[PDB]
């Protein structure tokens, strides 16, 4: 049941070993996070390994990597690190990541925009949760991404046409178009941001 | 707040009087509870969103602040949730060490 | 191995402080080793309240080596201090 299972104890033992190994060599932690691991492990690694706060040192270096997967993983890792550690330098790296996403909005093509912004959009909810000063930057970025992604929805004919559904209520929490999926992801992320900030 | 600032700079200028100054802040917190309550985020350096560094224990200015705060929190249970985690740990430490000053 | 010679150091405060600084390490093994240091030094620092608080806090930790070291430190400090023993 994700808490009273053998998998939880195995995860704790592995997290303890990784904590010891990262203390013994932080360069191993830097190399592993440059290689990357599945993002399902990210909350487990951030919560269970206390020496994960040193990842904020090379997240500015990791987010500058040419490969898109490295930048996606850097943003997703900083997402959990800002929740775990709300540092002033964590805020600086969060501002850097917001600027990187704003720049990659205007650098990447439409397929690359989908493949980059679908995983990294839930990171903005955690960025807003850790740093309430980031509300203006996150909301301006979300307006920009949504207005960019509505335009190529209008470019091609669509099977569901989300422009008409601009007046929709709060919905409950497969072969759809990538642009419409990205529009729904933007709407979902602003829904979670507003729900988090209201609570 | 002015009384606390003057007591703290007296503590800096004369560290021998730390027990008497702690008694002063115990009596000030215990008898002026509602007035200390809005002053708590100004005394404990509690950022609204940043995770604050744990203050150095056994630093006589910081115990002096905590003795004032905890004695104010004894008679007012309205806002004891303004404490962070390390302030609760320091509350346990002062209850173990300075139990004649800090109350339950 | 040098328990009889550590009663003649007389710069107790800064020595114990620089050992005690790594009770705050996130490593449970380092915390366990420091608890064993404090229990080993309990002959020359009785009634040292931050050591008592560290033993009390580490007795409730979730790491087995840290809890065992806290038990060892508590056994040493209870022999050398009655104010530690009563709580």
């Amino acid at each position: 049941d994700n808490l009273l299972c053998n998998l939880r104890e195995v995860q704790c033992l592995i997290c303890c070993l990784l904590h010891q190994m990262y203390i013994a060599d932080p360069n191993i932690a830097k190399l592993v996070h440059f290689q990357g691991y599945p993002c399902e492990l990210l909350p487990l690694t951030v919560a269970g390994i206390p020496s994960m706060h040193i990842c904020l040192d090379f997240i500015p270096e990791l987010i500058a990597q040419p490969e898109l997967e490295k930048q996606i993983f850097a943003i997703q890792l900083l997402s959990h690190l800002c929740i775990q550690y709300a540092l002033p330098k964590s805020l600086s790296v969060a501002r850097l990541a917001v600027n990187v996403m704003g720049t990659l909005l205007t650098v990447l093509t439409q397929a690359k925009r989908y493949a980059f912004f679908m995983p990294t959009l839930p990171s903005l909810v955690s960025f807003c949760r850790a740093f309430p000063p980031l509300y203006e930057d996150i909301m301006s970025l979300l307006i920009q991404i949504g207005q960019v992604c509505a335009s190529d929805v209008a470019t091609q004919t669509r099977d569901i046409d989300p422009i008409i559904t601009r007046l929709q209520q709060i919905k409950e929490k497969g072969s759809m178009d990538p642009d419409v999926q990205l529009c729904h992801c933007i709407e979902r992320t602003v829904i979670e941001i507003i729900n988090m900030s209201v609570s | 707040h002015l009384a606390l600032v003057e007591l703290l700079k007296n503590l800096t200028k004369y560290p021998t009087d730390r027990d008497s100054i702690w008694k002063c802040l115990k009596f000030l917190g215990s008898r002026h509870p509602t007035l200390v309550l809005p002053l708590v985020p100004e005394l404990l350096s509690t950022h609204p969103f940043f995770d604050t560094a744990e203050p150095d224990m056994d630093d006589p200015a910081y115990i002096a602040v905590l003795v004032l705060i905890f004695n104010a929190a004894k008679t007012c249970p309205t806002m004891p949730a303004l404490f962070s985690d390390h302030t609760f740990r320091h509350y346990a430490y002062l209850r173990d060490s300075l139990s004649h000053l800090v109350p339950a | 191995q040098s328990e009889k010679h550590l009663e003649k150091i007389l710069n107790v405060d800064e020595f114990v402080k620089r050992i005690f600084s790594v009770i705050h390490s996130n490593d449970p093994v380092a915390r366990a080793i420091t608890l064993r240091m404090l229990g080993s030094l309990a002959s020359i620092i009785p009634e040292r309240k931050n050591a008592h608080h560290s033993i009390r806090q580490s007795l409730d930790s979730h790491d087995n080596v840290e809890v065992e070291a806290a038990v060892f430190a508590a056994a040493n400090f209870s022999a050398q201090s009655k104010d530690f023993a009563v709580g």
């Binding site: 040193i54 | 560094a53 744990e54 | 790594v22």
Partner: peptide, 13 residues
């Protein structure tokens, strides 16, 4: 340092 929390108390020599 990887062995200490960022919110851990600092060591002043």
């Amino acid at each position: 340092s990887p062995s200490y929390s960022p919110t851990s108390p600092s060591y002043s020599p």
